[PDB]
């Protein structure tokens, strides 16, 4: 349904006249295609039947209940992202018309969802390399979709080079595996899981570690995320980790058969180093996207401890964490795409150049959001409080579940560092909350009419004029209450994760 509709959108888009209304309407055709895909997927795919694991397409693709969880999650998060490009994020024509200037935006996104959803299912080194390129090529194109922008093109060039080296490392590990065994199917390799150099699978992981931005490779991800348009950074900083971390978990599932300790020490060396950089790095930053880039690295460090431990509680910790972290990430970026309407306008010093690609770029552009919109400020406060790990939000249960998996497997050193690194990172999450509210009472009664939102035309002066569009507001509210009120249905959700199996059985 995804592939067939993609061809129809490719042909149709190249026929009709270049205009914003038609570009925005085609973006609403893709929102249907992704919705239709989820209905067909959930219809045939069930947890109860995919438990054993089912080979598809001459064993090239293997699907089980652990992979199947993430495909539905990926489809869901791709619906919430397409809602941004398909509806108004602000309603001001100047800021919004950027999302509709490109007709191939939705096509490239639909290309990536095919790439993302097939990566966890791969079961052959021949198709592992092909699928990882299909996902990797789609990201470079999306990073350069705004080809007029100098920073966007400079980022895609940086992205392509780093990913090309990353893909070469992945390709070289598979070749080395084929050299030793002569087999391509992953199941056939499992028969020789004790007879092959287990470090050649680690060389495979080193390639997948680059693509998720893990230190010492973290440098490029921070640069890329702080240069792309905020609508682009909202996608490329979350989606690759959804499908690669699922793949990394499976590869580590096979690896722990021989339980090689040297493999675990090197990965612990990278997890430990990344927590240090992910925490101390964000202390001295001014750009919000650079801040969320360091925040992303720290959460990936937590999620690797659940992957590295790889027990029965590690499935629960990973499955829960990857879901709550995606909703938190969408909620935060959606707010940053909206609160740009409250920016002031000059009528000077420090010569800060703002562009239509990142209207909100600095942390102090969040100033006085407690005054301009109190309800959305709390939503950003609740979201940041989840990242801090304050209970009983979603973020606490992610760290609590990760700690169970980590300590149950003897990772005492990493468990303590993650709890040190969490507190160090609380400093720079607290700065976002300091900027949001702390200067409320001095600014309470101010004469503000130079905001960007004050350039909106007055329609009637009799009817009520809401400040924020309908769809984006409903998404922000829904994900803010889900983050806040997870305590109500937490027991059902966690018991719904006990059933996700990866060859546990009995």
């Amino acid at each position: 349904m995804l592939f067939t509709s993609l061809l129809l959108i490719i042909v149709y888009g190249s026929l009709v006249n270049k205009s914003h209304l038609l570009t925005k309407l085609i973006n609403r055709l893709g929102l249907i295609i992704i919705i239709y895909t989820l209905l067909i997927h959930l219809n045939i795919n069930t947890l109860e039947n995919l438990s054993i694991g089912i080979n598809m397409f001459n064993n090239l693709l293997l699907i089980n209940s652990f992979n199947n969880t993430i495909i539905e999650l990926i489809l869901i998060i791709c619906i919430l992202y397409v809602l941004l490009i398909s509806f108004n994020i602000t309603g001001l024509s100047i800021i919004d018309n950027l999302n509709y200037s490109k007709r191939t935006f939705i096509v490239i996104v639909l290309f990536n969802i095919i790439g993302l959803t097939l990566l966890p299912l791969v079961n052959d080194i021949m198709i592992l390399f092909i699928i990882i390129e299909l996902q990797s090529y789609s990201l470079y194109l999306l990073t350069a979709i705004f080809n007029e922008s100098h920073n966007s093109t400079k980022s895609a060039l940086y992205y392509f080079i780093v990913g090309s080296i990353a893909s070469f490392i992945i390709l070289d590990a598979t070749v080395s595996i084929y050299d030793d065994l002569g087999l391509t199917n992953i199941q056939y390799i499992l028969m020789y899981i004790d007879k092959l150099e287990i470090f050649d699978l680690l060389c495979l992981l080193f390639g997948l570690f680059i693509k998720i931005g893990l230190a010492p490779f973290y440098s490029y991800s921070i640069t890329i995320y702080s240069l792309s348009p905020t609508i682009i950074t909202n996608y490329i900083s979350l989606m690759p980790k959804l499908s690669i971390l699922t793949l990394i978990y499976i590869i580590m599932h096979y690896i722990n058969i021989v339980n090689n300790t040297d493999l675990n020490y090197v990965i612990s060396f990278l997890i430990l180093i990344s927590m240090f950089i992910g925490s101390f790095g964000g202390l001295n930053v001014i750009r919000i996207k650079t801040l969320l880039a360091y925040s992303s690295l720290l959460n990936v460090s937590y999620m690797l401890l659940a992957i590295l431990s790889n027990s029965n509680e590690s499935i629960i910790a990973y499955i829960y964490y990857i879901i709550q972290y995606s909703l938190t990430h969408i909620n935060i970026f959606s707010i940053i795409l909206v609160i740009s309407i409250y920016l002031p306008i000059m009528n000077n010093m420090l010569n800060v150049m703002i562009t239509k690609y990142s209207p909100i770029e600095y942390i102090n552009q969040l100033k006085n959001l407690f005054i301009n919109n109190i309800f959305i400020a709390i939503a950003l406060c609740i979201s940041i409080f989840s990242l801090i790990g304050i209970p009983p939000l979603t973020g606490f249960y992610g760290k609590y579940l990760v700690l169970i998996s980590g300590l149950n497997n003897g990772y005492v050193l990493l468990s303590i560092v993650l709890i040190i690194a969490s507190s160090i990172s609380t400093v720079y999450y607290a700065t976002i909350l300091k900027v949001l509210s702390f200067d409320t009472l001095s600014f309470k009664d101010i004469i503000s009419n130079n905001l960007i939102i004050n350039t909106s035309p007055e329609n009637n002066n009799n009817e009520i004029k809401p400040e924020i569009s309908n769809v984006i507001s409903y998404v922000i509210s829904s994900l803010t209450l889900i983050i806040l009120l997870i305590i109500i249905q937490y027991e059902n959700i966690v018991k719904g994760a006990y059933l996700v199996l990866l060859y546990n059985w009995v």
């Binding site: 109860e48 438990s51 054993i52 694991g53 080979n55 064993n59 293997l62 199941q187 056939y188 499992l190 028969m191 899981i193 004790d194 722990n256 058969i257 021989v258 339980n259 027990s311 029965n312 509680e313 149950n408 006990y498 059933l499 199996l501 060859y503 546990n504 059985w505 009995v506």
Partner: protein
């Protein structure tokens, strides 16, 4: 009861190079694109093939 149920689910059986799940349901090489009978090294017979190890569905 909750402490009992969690103790059952959280437990992870030990896996070594002796017991682990391999998802191959059949022996390849019954038919080849050409020259199916090579040096006759295919000692495996498919007429009297022993039953394979079928997977366990813990929800059935």
């Amino acid at each position: 009861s909750t402490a009992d149920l969690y103790g059952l689910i959280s437990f992870t059986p030990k896996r070594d190079i002796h017991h682990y799940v391999i998802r191959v349901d059949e022996v390849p090489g019954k038919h080849f694109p050409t020259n199916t009978t090579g040096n006759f090294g295919n000692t495996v017979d498919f007429e009297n093939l022993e039953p394979r190890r079928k997977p366990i569905n813990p929800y059935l």
